[PDB]
Amino acid sequence: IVGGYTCGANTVPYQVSLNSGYHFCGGSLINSQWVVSAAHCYKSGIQVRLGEDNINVVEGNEQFISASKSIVHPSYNSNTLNNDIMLIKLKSAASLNSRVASISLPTSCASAGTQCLISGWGNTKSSGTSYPDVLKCLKAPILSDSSCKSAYPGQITSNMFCAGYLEGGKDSCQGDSGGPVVCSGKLQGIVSWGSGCAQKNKPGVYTKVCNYVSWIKQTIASN
């Protein structure tokens, strides 16, 4: 997360670290057996780590649960990054308490102007590299569709929204990918892509979760 602050241990109870030997992406717990992440984070052999804060030190609140199956959106396109959303079913139900909890899915889409919390263990530098060991947090407003389409001409589909700062210096980044964008206690987005990180006039782009609620509920009821 570039230009963010340390969240503090287990203050973001729905945040998950996806690990295949090393933390590679984040994700969000939506019920005790299912995680939502980004389809660009797909790989085989994912272990979901819940209850994390320092991802390099076992501190007492972790649950590491292997996934049973991963489902990429039927219409995911990796070249345009449209429909960048994937479901991960866990092998056992997780145990939910205040430090590990699920987040609600949206009933209504969020308007531009709404301030959201974005969090993850991705890169913290705009130039160069530095990956933190403890979870970072960023508050950022959803931008209007016209600032977003004017920053990324020809790239924004109806399933994408921008959030962040046009002046730069504060953004999500590589590694926060698949992580949560929470606004008024509902999951509204998934960290998806951007041009670099924290560049002037290049805000973060996020998968618009309210467009996916019926696919998520139907998939969960049948799998």
Query: Can you list the alpha helix ranges (DSSP code H) found in the chain?
Result: 145-151, 213-222
Catalytic residue among 28, 37, 119, 177, which? 177
* Residues 198-217, interacting with Ca ion (CB under 5 A): none
Least distance CB 60 / Ca ion (angstroms): 8
Query: Would you call 53 a catalytic residue per the annotation?
Result: no
Between CA 91 and CA 41 the distance in angstroms is 19
Q: Which residues contact 198 (CB under 8 A, 6 or more apart)?
A: 2, 3, 126, 168, 169, 170, 171, 173
Catalytic residue among 17, 70, 73, 84, which? 84
Between CA 176 and CA 180 the distance in angstroms is 9
Q: Which residues contact 42 (CB under 8 A, 6 or more apart)?
A: 70, 72, 86
Choices 53-61, 69-77, 120-128, 198-206 (CB under 5 A): range interacting with Ca ion = 53-61
Least distance CB 117 / Ca ion (angstroms): 21
* Residues 90-109, interacting with Ca ion (CB under 5 A): none
Least distance CB 57 / Ca ion (angstroms): 5
Placement of tokens 């998934």 in the chain: 190
Choices 59-67, 84-92, 101-109, 173-181 (CB under 5 A): range interacting with Ca ion = 59-67
Amino acid at position 216, single letter: I
* Separation of first and last alpha carbons in the chain: 33
* H or E stretch at 218: helix 213-222
Nearer to Ca ion among residue 99 and residue 170 (C-beta): 99
Biggest distance spanned by C-alpha atoms of the chain = 47
The 13-52 site mask, x for binding Ca ion (CB under 5 A), equals ---------------------------------------x
Least distance CB 134 / Ca ion (angstroms): 9
Query: Would you call 84 a catalytic residue per the annotation?
Result: yes
Least distance CB 219 / Ca ion (angstroms): 30
176 known member of a binding site: no
Beta bridge partners of 171: 2
Q: Which residues contact 67 (CB under 8 A, 6 or more apart)?
A: 35, 46, 47, 48, 88, 89, 90, 91
Beta bridge partners of 119: 137
Catalytic residues: 40, 84, 177
- Residues flagged as binding site for substrate: 171-172, 174-175, 177
Annotated binding site for Ca(2+): 52, 54, 57, 62
Could you list the residues known to form a binding site, using ranges.
52, 54, 57, 62, 171-172, 174-175, 177
Site residues (CB under 5 A) for Ca ion?
A: 52, 54, 59
